[PDB]
Short mmCIF file of C-alpha atoms in Angstrom, two decimals:
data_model
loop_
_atom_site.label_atom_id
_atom_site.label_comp_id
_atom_site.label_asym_id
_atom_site.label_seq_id
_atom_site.Cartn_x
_atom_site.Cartn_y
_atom_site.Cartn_z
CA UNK A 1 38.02 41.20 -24.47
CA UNK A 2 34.42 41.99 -23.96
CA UNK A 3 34.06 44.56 -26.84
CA UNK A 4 35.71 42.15 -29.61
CA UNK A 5 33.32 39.37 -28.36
CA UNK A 6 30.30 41.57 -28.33
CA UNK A 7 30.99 42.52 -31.38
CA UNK A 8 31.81 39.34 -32.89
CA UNK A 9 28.16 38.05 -30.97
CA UNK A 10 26.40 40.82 -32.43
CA UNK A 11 27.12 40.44 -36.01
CA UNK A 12 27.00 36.68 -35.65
CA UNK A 13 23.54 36.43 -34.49
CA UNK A 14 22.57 38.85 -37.05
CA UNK A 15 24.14 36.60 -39.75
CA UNK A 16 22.82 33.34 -38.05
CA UNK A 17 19.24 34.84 -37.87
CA UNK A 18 19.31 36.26 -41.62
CA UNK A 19 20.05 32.97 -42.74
CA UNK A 20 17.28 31.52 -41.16
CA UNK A 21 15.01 33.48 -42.34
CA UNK A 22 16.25 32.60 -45.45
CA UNK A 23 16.33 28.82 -45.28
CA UNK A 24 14.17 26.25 -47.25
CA UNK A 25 13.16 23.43 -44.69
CA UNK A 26 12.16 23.98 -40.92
CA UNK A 27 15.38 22.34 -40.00
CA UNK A 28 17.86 24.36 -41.80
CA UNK A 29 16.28 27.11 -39.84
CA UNK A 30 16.16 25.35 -36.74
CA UNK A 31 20.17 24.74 -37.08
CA UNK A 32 20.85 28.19 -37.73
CA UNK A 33 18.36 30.13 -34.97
CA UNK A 34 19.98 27.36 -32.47
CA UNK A 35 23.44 28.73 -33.46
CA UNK A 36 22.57 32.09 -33.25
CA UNK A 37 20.73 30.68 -29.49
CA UNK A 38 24.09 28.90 -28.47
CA UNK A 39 26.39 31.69 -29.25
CA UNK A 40 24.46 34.07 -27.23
CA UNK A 41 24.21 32.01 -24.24
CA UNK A 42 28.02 31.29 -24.19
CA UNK A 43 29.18 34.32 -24.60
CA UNK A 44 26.67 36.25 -22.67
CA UNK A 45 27.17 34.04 -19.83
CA UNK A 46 31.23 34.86 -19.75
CA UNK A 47 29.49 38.78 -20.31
CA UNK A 48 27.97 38.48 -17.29
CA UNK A 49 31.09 37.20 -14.99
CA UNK A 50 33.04 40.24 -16.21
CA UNK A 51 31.24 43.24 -17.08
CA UNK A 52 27.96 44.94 -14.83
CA UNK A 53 28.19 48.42 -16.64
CA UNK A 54 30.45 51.91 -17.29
CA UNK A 55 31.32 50.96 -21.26
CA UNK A 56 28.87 53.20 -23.77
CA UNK A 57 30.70 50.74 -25.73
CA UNK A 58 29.59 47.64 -24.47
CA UNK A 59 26.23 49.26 -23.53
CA UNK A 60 24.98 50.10 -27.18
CA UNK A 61 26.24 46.63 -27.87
CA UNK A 62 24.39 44.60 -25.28
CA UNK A 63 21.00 46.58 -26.23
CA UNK A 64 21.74 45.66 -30.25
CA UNK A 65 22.07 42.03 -29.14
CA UNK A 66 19.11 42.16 -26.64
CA UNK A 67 17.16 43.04 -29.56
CA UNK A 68 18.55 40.09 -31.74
CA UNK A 69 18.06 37.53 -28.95
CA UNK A 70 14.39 38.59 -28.56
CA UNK A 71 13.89 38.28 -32.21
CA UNK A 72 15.75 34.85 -32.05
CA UNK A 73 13.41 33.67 -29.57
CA UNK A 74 10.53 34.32 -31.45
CA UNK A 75 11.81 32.79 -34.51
CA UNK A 76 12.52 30.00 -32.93
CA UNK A 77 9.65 29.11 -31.00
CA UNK A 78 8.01 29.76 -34.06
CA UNK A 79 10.03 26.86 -35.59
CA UNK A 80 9.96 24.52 -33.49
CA UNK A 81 6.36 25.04 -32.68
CA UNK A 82 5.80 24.17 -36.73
CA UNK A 83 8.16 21.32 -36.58
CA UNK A 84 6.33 19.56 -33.53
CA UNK A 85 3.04 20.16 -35.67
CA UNK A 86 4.27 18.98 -38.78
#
């Protein structure tokens, strides 16, 4: 069900993401960018073994969470970066 999951991914990573941004210490962040991290690579990976294209659907989708997982990997580079240093 590619369009429920995408939209499930979607709005999780968005949530995951907020929250970090939101958090206190560098690991509450940490736990929630890696969430939004894990998600993502799960279920794109099952993406990817189903769906190659032909769903304006699923299209607008994927480029809303390509956006979110380039975020994400700023964020938490960013994170980590600062908890090695600190």
């Amino acid at each position: 069900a590619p369009v429920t999951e995408l939209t499930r991914l979607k709005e999780y990573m968005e949530d995951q993401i907020a929250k970090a941004k939101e958090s206190s210490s560098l690991t509450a962040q940490l736990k929630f960018l890696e969430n939004a991290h894990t998600e993502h690579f799960v279920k794109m990976g099952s993406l990817t073994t189903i769906y190659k294209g032909g769903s304006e659907v699923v299209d607008r989708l994927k480029i809303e969470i390509r956006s979110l997982y380039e975020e994400m990997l700023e964020l938490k580079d960013k994170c980590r970066d600062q908890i090695q240093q600190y």
